[PDB]
Amino acid sequence: DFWDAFNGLDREVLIQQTLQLLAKENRPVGLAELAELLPPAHDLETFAVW
Amino acid sequence: TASLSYALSPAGSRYPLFGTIILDEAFSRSSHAVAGRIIAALREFGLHAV
Numbered sequence: 001d002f003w004d005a006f007n008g009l010d011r012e013v014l015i016q017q018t019l020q021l022l023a024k025e026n027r028p029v030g031l032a033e034l035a036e037l038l039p040p041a042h043d044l045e046t047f048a049v050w
Numbered sequence: 051t052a053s054l055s056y057a058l059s060p061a062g063s064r065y066p067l068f069g070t071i072i073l074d075e076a077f078s079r080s081s082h083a084v085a086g087r088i089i090a091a092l093r094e095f096g097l098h099a100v
Contacts, residue, residue, distance in 0.1 A: 001081060001082040001086075004082050005081070005082050
């Protein structure tokens with residue numbers, strides 16, 4: 001459990017990832033598209049962040 | 051949660067007639083496994099949690 005709490009998603013890295021994705025796409029990217037493009041590991045928190 | 055189950059359940063029925071519960075800041079200070087065990091307590095009491 002200590003190592004579960006040890007690691008997870010990072011909000012700021014997700015900010016950078018979304019910035020890169022939406023600069024590359026240069027268009028409205030829906031939630032399903034963002035989840036598919038960005039590899040899902042902590043997908044709940046990525047949806048929340050988006 | 052044990053007491054609220056007590057209050058919410060008349061005798062006879064295994065479940066209280068109102069099964070829902072709400073938790074603000076749920077688990078804001080419990081180690082991950084501790085949170086899991088509390089969740090297990092909720093499930094033992096058989097409640098629908100928020």
